[PDB]
Design a protein around this ligand. Structure first.
Ligand SMILES: Nc1ncnc2c1ncn2[C@@H]1O[C@H](COP(=O)(O)OP(=O)(O)OP(=O)(O)O)[C@@H](O)[C@H]1O
Ligand SMILES: Nc1ncnc2c1ncn2[C@@H]1O[C@H](COP(=O)(O)OP(=O)(O)O)[C@@H](O)[C@H]1O
Ligand SMILES: Nc1ncnc2c1ncn2[C@@H]1O[C@H](COP(=O)(O)OP(=O)(O)O)[C@@H](O)[C@H]1O
Ligand SMILES: [Mg+2]
Ligand SMILES: [Mg+2]
Ligand SMILES: [Mg+2]
Ligand SMILES: [Zn+2]
Ligand SMILES: [Zn+2]
Lengths: 619, 99, 444, 49, 189
């Protein structure tokens, strides 16, 4: 019921405390379901099955069945939340009385609060009220331990001053010891205390929602005991919490308006491997067109460059790493370099790889890089803790670093990427950190040739500004020429304009994550083995290719290329999800490796090799 | 695990043990080590032999001429104006002393 | 924080700045970069420890003394008497806030905000034919010739339609223009015209802008713990125009920064203890001196100027202004500027006033053209013809980025005429604009 | 060596290091894979082994 | 500490008939180790606090080996009576000095308030080192940042590890105790 006094004082009175606690118990037990299920029974069943420590309830259901509580909720949320903690504790103990050891506490979260305010507009009129809001996490410190029921050693006599509850507002302070009667220098008993997880995030208004002439505004937020690490930086998150002012934040200091900071005790944060995967992946792997389906599922937002779609497929699935003895580093990573004249989807390719492949990061030879190739240690600014920011490769240790504009990286990045793909370990020796972080990168890269146009007369090495050892070890070199042509340009223009009209704001092969599950399955679980290839055929293949390449200015095919051939064979076997490499796979790996080698070779020699080796490129 | 290059394998063998340093009664010093230069082609396993020899030495560091990722080649020492200590960045040469 | 308007500066004077407090309901009305009139009190807020020299200090007038061992001297004495310096600072207390040059007396919402007279004015403006050349003349009554630059800059002001893919790739909608030419060819003059004309038209020149002020900076809230992300030139030009002069003479460290802005329409600053992702959808009008001072028509554009290849790729339109010596044109220019100087106030015939066209821009901006199927067919076939031209050789080669430029300019012409459909008229004119922009390198 | 591999025409010139850093050394091997059909086919055998 | 003095007793009896000088039974540190899998540095919630935790990490720096006390003798300023052999606690845990001299014989008057000055020479101290352990780079998830932890070594855990050496380290989670920012109850763990 209602009276002249305020809502908060009302709900503070004991009579209505029992009233609303009874009402919460009542609808917890009785609000069966939309369609007669008693959903609270099943929710509590799962809650205690995992020991989640936290229930969540829908505000629409709350208000619809019992509306007085819903109206009271934003007015004096703290008191209602405490009582619902107690009532939920009662009902969960009723369902499972064995729960008593489990945390002695249940939190309750409220979802779908109808009235969302915007971080631009949170005024005095929302203090001490439960609001709903949206934003992006700009920072999120680590999980810290907070006092929740603290016991103090009176260090005059070592009496254990009993467990004081710790509100978020002001630090608890014992008056005196019940034994020796001193307000002594008390100090926390580290053990008998039962702490509580504390994490501090900072959300800000999303640029997609910020207005024209503006700076997005940022509100702090505190996560406690179950929601810590429920959201990482850059996550678009809805936040529901008690917008809050009265803790100790106030500019009572000199030189300041009497102006208060604010926080949000977050009461609900909402962001915005498997089984049967073997079944689906193997069932489609039966099809045996799966190689071309993968080749046509890789990079659908690009036209042409089928050679590079295939090549990046082989780079994505990789080979296998081996070490005969503890003496020979032979690698499973297939490194790729697109070299292309401008405006030919190099960065488009790279961003597709970043989107699709797990443990992918992006980096640029220029200084605009999100993540850097070098490794450095400093005090990271948004956290101000002294990190070892290990570079881009190490951060992409398993999967892919993607080096866009590979042809302009500063000489330090040249040194670092060379030493990465050569050693496969990045050797840091800056402050006192003389270590070697292993970097099993699978580098993809893009490079614009000299003069902004590919020059078929000169060779690849001398018309791209990447020095010989760097250009060598890349398992695939691909050339991208923007050759003017009627039908090609017609097709490209029609595709682009179709995308544009489709992407007007009025209109608002295998799927990509299907391919991603395929990627991890065939990258870790499946290791095709090789005793089933015409060893003599490939040995004579190297013989014939190098024998033709014997000439001046004709740096020949070598063992680098023959091991790259085996890597590509394994990769195609992986791609076929087989457990044994087959002559078909060996033929395809031969085809792609030889295509890469001839197109590396300049025009006249390219035509000689193409004419005399068309039998393999025929397949 | 490399085909042939038998003279190079024996050369690496002699290299790994190295000579014997001479400090003379005057005081001068003569080296007790061996240097192996390996000019040549791409195709042969030059960097791979470098890789193994680094793995197989008791203490050994395999670097590029152009320093290393967040690691120089020669040592450097630099004053720190705040604390005045001469911090000593250790290169490959000194980080593999005796190596 | 506000500062003196540029009109009111004394001689040799830094612009003074004072702090203005905005109490309830007049609170978010001001915004960074605006030109706002404020009305209210001038108050004084107490300051402390502003000076190292002792000044005016209050103290109680009670005549107490100090007993022995507790004598009211030194720190005890000052605390006992309650001594406190009285140092103040002017802090304006804005009771109300309006734009100093209001746009209106108040697409459908802005249309409702339109008064009847301005509504019929912009209506007959849209219904007008020859509005193309009329807008050219009104924007640039001073200029003679340079019709291609007039057209490109007008289309730049109207802008294209930003779009975004299902995957999340932010297709550019702005259209950056570059003016490159021999010295004293009205390049900086065009940029100044755009600056003085439009709102959200920030201006900067070459090496006069270090990167921090160029794009964004950071300060700590002097009151609270939070941090204020100070807005740089790109931000203040957000959803508008940034006129960069001596574009070729920008350091790499910041030309890459504006390149990032051009690629992503956004810059994320993480520095000195605050991280944020600031939006900047501005369009860049650049001026670039050729290498050697004079453009050379026997060389390609990429070797006449010294921009980074990705920057040059991003730049939507490139105009070449060669200072040839033809005397009919010379007579025209001399007559024009001397006529202006003799008759300053008159001798301007902007057929639509600056306020009229500015309101027209603000009203037109919110119309987002489609692209009909016939226009799409014409687009693809005309780009094919452009590639056939490319296949002699132009001073800067044709790629798919020029297709992107042409479609964005077609969108911006539809935006000029406030249409909901880009037609072959717009497509033809956009192609003509690009075709005349791209010139054949002239070997002897 | 500078010119990709060891071309026989540039013998006594196909090295760019200074003599005052070839002096320091104690053995300096050149490695060229010029014309050995049996060796190279056996090398393919060896690496895939 | 029980294990430590237990080791001390068994040590003295095994080495019992000791020679001259080396007779005062020296303190016997007892470090630990295990064979179970280390747990990640991201798994240190509140509930694993003041327990026994083994973790994997990578050192990234190491403060100097400096001197923290374990026994400290103070003496009053009036009567100069000492109060020797005070059990200074281990780890990062300060100790509020005693407040009033306890003689009942300082004279006809009494000793002042807060009379004790620490006797520096009569403090028996140890080595300690504040390490900055950072999460394992391969352990760090994709988008996140490397977590950290302040570490406190002891007598013969000092200088056994140099900056950059990955460690599996067995110790005790703890918060500092120096006498009891939009947050409260958050001491430096
Ligand atoms: N084959 C293609 N399919 C689709 N879009 C393409 C293709 N080739 C070029 N484009 C378009 O060209 C524009 C430039 O693409 P991208 O970012 O890859 O440039 P680039 O050639 O790598 O240039 P730079 O050297 O400046 O990085 C993009 O709009 C891309 O859509
Ligand atoms: N004789 C060989 N047997 C097997 N593999 C070889 C041989 N020679 C070279 N390789 C392969 O070539 C790759 C690169 O050779 P590398 O060690 O870089 O020497 P170089 O620096 O001269 O290229 C190595 O990873 C190695 O696997
Ligand atoms: N076509 C023209 N029409 C009108 N004025 C011109 C023309 N060409 C040059 N001028 C005059 O030249 C002056 C300087 O031109 P400006 O663009 O500043 O040179 P720069 O491009 O080197 O900065 C302008 O003030 C303008 O009056
Ligand atoms: Mg690119
Ligand atoms: Mg090598
Ligand atoms: Mg100028
Ligand atoms: Zn007590
Ligand atoms: Zn005393």
């Amino acid at each position: 019921d209602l009276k002249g006094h305020s809502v908060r004082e009302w709900v503070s009175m004991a009579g209505p405390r029992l009233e609303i606690h009874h009402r919460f118990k009542n609808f917890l037990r009785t609000h069966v379901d939309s369609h007669g299920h008693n959903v609270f029974k099943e929710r509590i069943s799962d809650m205690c099955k995992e020991n989640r420590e936290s229930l969540v309830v829908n505000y629409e259901d709350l208000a619809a069945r019992e509306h007085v509580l819903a109206y009271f909720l934003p007015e004096a949320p703290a008191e209602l939340l405490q009582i619902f903690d107690e009532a939920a504790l009662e009902v969960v103990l009723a369902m499972y009385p064995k729960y008593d050891r489990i945390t002695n506490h249940i939190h309750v979260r409220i979802s779908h609060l109808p009235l969302v305010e915007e971080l631009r507009s949170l005024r005095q009129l929302h203090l001490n009220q439960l609001i709903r809001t949206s934003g992006v996490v700009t920072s999120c410190t680590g999980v810290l331990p907070q006092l929740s029921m603290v016991k103090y050693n009176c260090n005059k006599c070592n009496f254990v001053l009993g467990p004081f509850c710790q509100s978020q507002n002001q630090e608890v302070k014992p008056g005196s010891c019940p034994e020796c009667q001193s307000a002594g220098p008390f100090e926390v008993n580290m053990e008998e205390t039962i702490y509580q997880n504390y994490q501090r995030i900072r959300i800000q208004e999303s640029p997609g929602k910020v207005a024209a002439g503006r700076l997005p505004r940022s509100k702090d937020a505190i996560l406690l005991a179950d929601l810590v690490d429920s959201c990482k930086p850059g996550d678009e998150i809805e936040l529901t919490g008690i917008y809050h002012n009265n803790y100790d934040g106030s500019l009572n200091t000199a030189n300041g308006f009497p102006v208060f900071a604010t926080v949000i005790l977050a009461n609900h944060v909402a962001k915005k491997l498997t089984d049967e995967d073997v079944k689906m992946i193997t069932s489609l792997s039966k099809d045996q067109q799966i190689g071309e389906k993968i080749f046509a599922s890789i990079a659908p937002s690009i036209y042409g460059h089928e050679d590079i779609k295939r090549g990046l497929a082989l780079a994505l699935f990789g080979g296998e790493p081996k070490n005969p003895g503890g003496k020979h580093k032979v690698r499973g990573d297939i490194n790729v370099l697109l070299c292309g004249d401008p405006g030919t989807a190099k960065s488009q390719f790279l961003k597709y790889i970043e989107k699709v492949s797990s443990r992918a990061i992006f980096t640029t030879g220029q200084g605009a890089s999100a993540v850097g190739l070098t490794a450095y240690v400093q005090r990271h600014p948004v956290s101000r803790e002294w990190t070892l920011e290990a570079g881009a490769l190490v951060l992409a240790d398993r999967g892919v670093c993607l080096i866009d504009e590979f042809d302009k990286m500063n000489d330090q990045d040249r040194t670092s990427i060379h030493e990465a793909m050569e050693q496969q370990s990045i050797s840091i020796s800056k402050a006192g950190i003389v270590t070697s972080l292993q970097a099993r990168c699978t580098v993809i890269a893009a490079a614009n040739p000299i003069g902004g146009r590919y020059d078929p007369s000169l060779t690849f090495s001398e018309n791209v500004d990447l020095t010989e050892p760097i250009i060598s070890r890349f398992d695939i070199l691909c050339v991208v020429r923007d050759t003017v042509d009627p039908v090609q340009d017609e097709m490209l223009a029609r595709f682009v304009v179709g995308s544009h009209v489709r992407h007007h704001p009025s209109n608002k092969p295998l799927p990509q994550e299907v391919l991603k599950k395929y990627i991890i399955y065939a990258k870790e679980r499946v290791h095709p083995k090789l005793n089933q290839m015409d060893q003599d055929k490939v040995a004579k293949m190297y013989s014939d290719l190098r024998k033709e390449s014997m000439a001046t200015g004709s740096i020949p095919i070598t063992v680098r290329h023959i091991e790259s051939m085996i890597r590509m064979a394994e990769a195609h076997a992986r791609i076929h999800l087989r457990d044994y490499v087959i002559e078909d796979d060996v033929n395809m790996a031969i085809r792609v490796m030889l295509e890469s080698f001839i197109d590396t070779q300049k025009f006249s020699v390219m035509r000689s090799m193409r004419k005399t080796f068309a039998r393999y490129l025929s397949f | 695990s490399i085909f042939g290059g038998t003279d190079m394998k024996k050369a690496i063998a002699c290299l790994l043990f190295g000579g014997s340093r001479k400090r003379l009664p005057d005081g001068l010093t003569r080296r007790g080590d061996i240097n192996l230069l390996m000019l040549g082609d791409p195709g042969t396993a030059k960097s791979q032999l470098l890789k193994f020899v680094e793995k197989c030495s008791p203490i050994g560091v395999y670097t590029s001429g152009k320093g290393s990722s967040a690691a120089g080649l020669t040592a450097s020492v630099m004053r720190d104006p705040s604390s005045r200590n001469f911090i000593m960045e250790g290169g490959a040469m000194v980080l593999a002393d005796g190596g | 924080r506000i500062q003196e308007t540029q009109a009111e500066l004394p001689r040799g004077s830094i612009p003074r700045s004072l702090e203005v407090i905005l109490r309830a309901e007049a609170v978010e009305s001001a915004q960074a970069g605006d030109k706002c009139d404020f009305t209210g009190t001038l108050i004084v807020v107490p300051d402390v420890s502003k000076l190292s020299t002792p000044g005016a200090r209050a103290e109680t007038n009670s005549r107490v003394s100090g007993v022995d061992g507790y004598e009211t001297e030194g720190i005890r004495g000052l605390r006992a008497l309650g001594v406190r310096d009285l140092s103040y600072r002017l802090v304006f207390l804005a009771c109300c806030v309006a734009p100093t040059n209001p746009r209106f007396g108040g697409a459908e919402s802005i249309k409702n905000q339109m008064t009847v007279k301005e509504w019929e004015k912009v209506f007959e403006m849209s219904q007008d034919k020859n509005l193309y050349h009329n807008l050219c003349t009104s924007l640039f009554p001073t200029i003679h010739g340079n019709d291609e630059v007039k057209r490109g800059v007008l289309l730049m002001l109207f802008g294209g339609v930003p779009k975004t893919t299902g995957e999340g790739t932010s297709l550019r909608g702005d259209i950056n223009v570059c003016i490159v030419g021999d010295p004293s060819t009205a390049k900086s003059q065009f940029l100044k015209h755009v600056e003085e004309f439009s709102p959200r038209a920030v201006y900067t020149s070459g090496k006069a802008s270090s990167a921090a002020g160029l794009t964004a900076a950071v300060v700590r809230d002097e009151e609270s713990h939070e941090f204020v992300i100070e807005a740089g030139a790109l931000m203040l030009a957000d959803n508008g125009v940034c006129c960069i002069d001596e574009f070729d003479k920008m350091d790499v460290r910041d030309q890459v920064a504006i390149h990032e802005a051009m690629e992503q329409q956004t810059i994320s600053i993480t520095k000195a203890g605050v991280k944020a992702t600031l939006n900047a959808r501005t369009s860049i009008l650049a001026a670039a001196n050729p290498i050697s001072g004079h453009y050379d028509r026997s060389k390609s554009l990429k070797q006449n100027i010294n921009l980074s290849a990705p920057i040059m790729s991003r730049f939507d339109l490139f105009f070449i202004l060669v200072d040839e010596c033809n005397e009919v044109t010379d007579y025209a220019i001399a007559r024009r500027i001397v006529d202006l100087h003799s008759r300053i106030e008159e001798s301007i015939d902007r057929v639509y006033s600056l306020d009229d066209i500015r309101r027209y821009l603000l009203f037109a901006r919110q119309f987002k053209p489609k692209i009909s199927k016939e226009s799409e067919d014409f687009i693809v076939e005309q780009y094919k013809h452009l590639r056939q031209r490319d296949g002699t050789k132009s001073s800067w080669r044709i790629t798919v980025r020029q297709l992107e430029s042409m479609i964005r300019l077609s969108e911006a012409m539809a935006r000029m005429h406030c249409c909901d459909e880009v037609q072959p008229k717009h497509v033809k004119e956009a192609f003509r604009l690009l075709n005349k922009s791209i010139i054949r390198v002239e070997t002897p | 060596s500078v010119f990709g591999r060891w071309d026989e025409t540039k013998g006594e010139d196909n090295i760019d290091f200074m003599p005052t850093i070839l002096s320091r050394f104690d053995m300096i091997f050149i490695v060229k894979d010029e014309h050995n059909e049996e060796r190279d086919v056996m090398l393919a055998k060896h690496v895939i082994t | 500490q029980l294990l430590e003095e237990a080791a001390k007793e068994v040590a003295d009896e095994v080495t019992r008939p000791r020679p001259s000088g080396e007779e005062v039974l020296q303190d016997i540190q007892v470090m630990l180790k295990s064979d179970a899998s280390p747990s990640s540095i991201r798994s240190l919630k509140s509930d694993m606090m003041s327990h026994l935790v083994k973790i994997p990490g990578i050192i990234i720096a190491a403060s100097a080996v400096r001197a923290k006390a374990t026994r400290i003798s103070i003496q009053c300023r009036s009567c100069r009576n000492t109060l020797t052999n005070i059990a200074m606690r281990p780890g990062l845990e300060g100790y509020a000095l005693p407040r009033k001299c306890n003689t009942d014989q300082a004279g006809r008057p009494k000793c002042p308030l807060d009379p004790y000055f620490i006797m520096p020479d009569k403090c028996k101290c140890v080595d300690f080192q504040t390490l900055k352990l950072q999460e394992l780079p391969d352990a760090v998830p994709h988008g996140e940042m490397p977590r950290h932890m302040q570490l406190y070594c002891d007598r013969y855990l000092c200088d056994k590890v140099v900056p950059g050496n990955r460690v599996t380290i067995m110790g005790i989670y703890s918060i500092k105790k120096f006498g009891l920012r939009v947050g409260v109850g958050i001491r430096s763990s």
